Amino acid sequence: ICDGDTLLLSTTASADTFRWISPNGIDTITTVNSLMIVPTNGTYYQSGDWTLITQVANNCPSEPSAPSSVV
Amino acid sequence: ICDGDTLLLSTTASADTFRWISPNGIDTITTVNSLMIVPTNGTYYQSGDWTLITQVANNCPSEPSAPSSVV
Numbered sequence: 001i002c003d004g005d006t007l008l009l010s011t012t013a014s015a016d017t018f019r020w021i022s023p024n025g026i027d028t029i030t031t032v033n034s035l036m037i038v039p040t041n042g043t044y045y046q047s048g049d050w051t052l053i054t055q056v057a058n059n060c061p062s063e064p065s066a067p068s069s070v071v
Numbered sequence: 072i073c074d075g076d077t078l079l080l081s082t083t084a085s086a087d088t089f090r091w092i093s094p095n096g097i098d099t100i101t102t103v104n105s106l107m108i109v110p111t112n113g114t115y116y117q118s119g120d121w122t123l124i125t126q127v128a129n130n131c132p133s134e135p136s137a138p139s140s141v142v
Contacts (some may be wrong), residue, residue: 012096 001071002063007045009070015054015062023048023070047071072142078116080109080141086125086133094119094141118142 001009001042011033020028020035023046028035037044049067056062072078080091084105091099091106091133099106108115120138127133 017055087128
């Protein structure tokens with residue numbers, strides 16, 4: 001990703017509480033299978049290994065996804 | 072596979088419910104030991120590691136096949 005390119009993290013899962021976990025340790029939560037990270041966002045527009053934990057119509061988290069590398 | 076080349080995934084198994092699993096996490100089901108993926112199919116015409124789970128005259132899935140890499 002170049003410095004001016006929006007970072008889009010996404011999944012194949014249908015779920016609630018899709019919690020995207022940043023390489024810095026920042027846990028951000030959405031309702032859709034996508035997280036849009038704006039290039040000016042200094043805490044999420046990072047590069048490294050990202051993971052995802054989700055829930056489906058319940059309060060039980062998914063097994064975390066294998067981390068994936070963002071460049 | 073070049074961009075204009077049809078992707079054909081196939082097996083040696085005789086089975087029912089041959090479920091082909093895409094690298095994106097998309098589970099598609101056929102009745103024959105073959106899956107034809109058209110070059111314009113943006114969700115299945117991917118490259119990566121694919122696996123297969125099958126059933127034989129029953130409701131019990133096979134042990135998943137070793138993933139194979141599509142280029």
